[PDB]
Every structure is written in structure tokens, then in C-alpha cells.
Amino acid sequence: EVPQLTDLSFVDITDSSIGLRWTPLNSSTIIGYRITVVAAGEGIPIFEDFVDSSVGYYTVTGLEPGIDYDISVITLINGGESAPTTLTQQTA
């Protein structure tokens, strides 16, 4: 089963943006990461995007101040993916 990121961190929290940092996983099985962002209690994501496997840094943009977002980063392999590493962060 696919490895989850074990060190997702939030940095540079503003009223409209949250910075995500993590250490890229090294296995050549890994094709990238999906970032999914949900305003906490909503039933569908607001934001979802992809970065290739080289990336350890993504800034979520166009957020609303004072809202909790559940931010998930999912490890991808060809035809598979991890359980999500999900953390909640409020904007400023």
C-alpha cells in the first residue's frame, strides 16, 4: 500500500492563502501528489490540483479569511494512491 506523507506542514498562513510543505517521497513508484482542499463541513472540495513527484511545496490560493480548511495531500503511483494525509488549518 502506498506511503503517506508523514511531515505535511503549513507555512505563511495569510487571510487568503496557506503554504504547504512536505518532504518528497523517494520511491520510483511515485508519480506525484494530489492536493485537495475542502472548506471544513462542505461536501465537495473547492480546490484540487496536481504536482509531479519532484515537488515538496504548494501554495493554496484564493481562500477566505477565518475559514477552516481540511487540506489533504495524497501520494500517487500509477493506478493507485495513498490514504490522504489531512490536516486542518484556518486562514487569518
Binding site: 471544513a40 462542505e42 465537495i44 473547492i46 490540483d49 475559514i67 477552516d68 490522504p84 484556518q90
Partner: protein, 175 residues
């Protein structure tokens, strides 16, 4: 990269309230049932979607206010719903994609304006299709049959029972 989600239903399976009256749908709607295909982390103290306020504008769009309860605090989010090809159908206001959705869809499946409404939502992000159905009341209280219909509809769209919830409501955020 093939999506592992429950697939979104064909639109043929998502009716529209016939003779939809935009002026009557207008107002406050409490969340009574929710169902969708996003996988939701098991949480022992989840944030809640309390209510949705639909304000009909002169241009026939809606100003939508989502009322949320997050870590014990009321929160308020704004969307615009722009009308679609049929009455009771809408899309969200133009929003930047990526990383926003490449398409959205809202269908008011059924409503009697003064008691209940059931709304279908779809958000597509390129390959990946998320969908949601919300059962709403003008109060927090609905009839068993109305709830049982929502269950049956959610199932007709391919949603297992565990993705179909009736959250216990708050006493907050409204009055």
C-alpha cells in the same frame, strides 16, 4: 490517474423540479440530510453545514450564503449561482480553474418551496468528478417519507448507505 471515486451519475438520473419557481426557492434552507462521493475522514467532532441562504437577484442568479459551524464558531461563505440550460439548474460563478473546478452543476431535484428541497451538486476537476446531494427544510424538521426519498435518490446515484447522513443540527448561527 484514473479516478477511484464512485462515478458521477448520468444527468438522465438527475431530475429537475418541474415548473421550478426561482422566486419561491429564495430564502433560508436548513441542512437536514447530506450525501456525496467524497470520502470523509472519520471525525469524532465534525464541522457542520448548517444552512444555505439563496438570495434571488434581478439578473435571476442567486447570491448563495453557506452557513457553517467550525470548531464551535459560525462561519459564512459566499457563492454565486448562475442559471443553466433548464429552470432549477445552475452553475457556480466563474472561478479560477485550475485549481478550481473546470465545471460545476446544481440541479434542484425536488421542492415544495415551503417545506423541503433536495439539491444535486457536481464539481468536476478535470478527470475527477465529485457530487453531493443535500436535503434541505425550511425548518430543521422533516417528514420520514421526505427523508426516505432522499435516501432512495442518493442510492439511485450509486451512493452506499454510509455515505448518506442526517447530521444532528446545531442550535446556533441563524437567530
Amino acid at each position: 490517474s484514473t479516478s477511484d471515486l464512485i462515478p458521477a451519475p448520468p444527468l438522465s438520473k438527475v431530475p429537475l423540479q418541474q415548473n421550478f419557481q426561482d422566486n419561491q426557492f429564495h430564502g433560508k434552507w436548513y441542512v437536514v440530510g447530506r450525501a456525496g462521493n467524497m470520502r470523509l475522514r472519520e471525525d469524532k467532532d465534525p464541522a457542520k453545514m448548517v444552512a444555505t441562504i439563496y438570495e434571488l437577484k434581478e439578473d435571476k442568479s442567486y447570491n448563495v450564503t453557506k452557513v457553517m459551524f467550525q470548531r464551535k464558531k459560525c462561519k459564512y461563505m459566499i457563492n454565486t449561482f448562475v442559471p443553466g440550460s433548464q429552470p432549477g439548474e445552475f452553475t457556480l460563478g466563474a472561478i479560477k480553474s485550475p485549481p478550481g473546478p473546470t465545471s460545476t452543476l446544481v440541479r434542484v431535484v425536488s421542492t415544495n418551496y415551503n417545506q423541503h428541497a433536495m439539491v444535486f451538486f457536481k464539481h468536476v476537476f478535470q478527470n475527477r468528478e465529485y457530487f453531493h446531494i443535500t436535503l434541505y427544510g425550511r425548518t430543521k424538521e422533516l417528514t420520514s417519507e421526505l427523508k426516505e426519498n432522499f435516501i432512495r435518490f442518493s442510492k439511485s446515484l450509486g451512493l452506499p448507505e454510509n455515505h448518506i447522513v442526517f447530521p444532528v443540527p446545531i442550535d446556533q448561527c441563524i437567530d
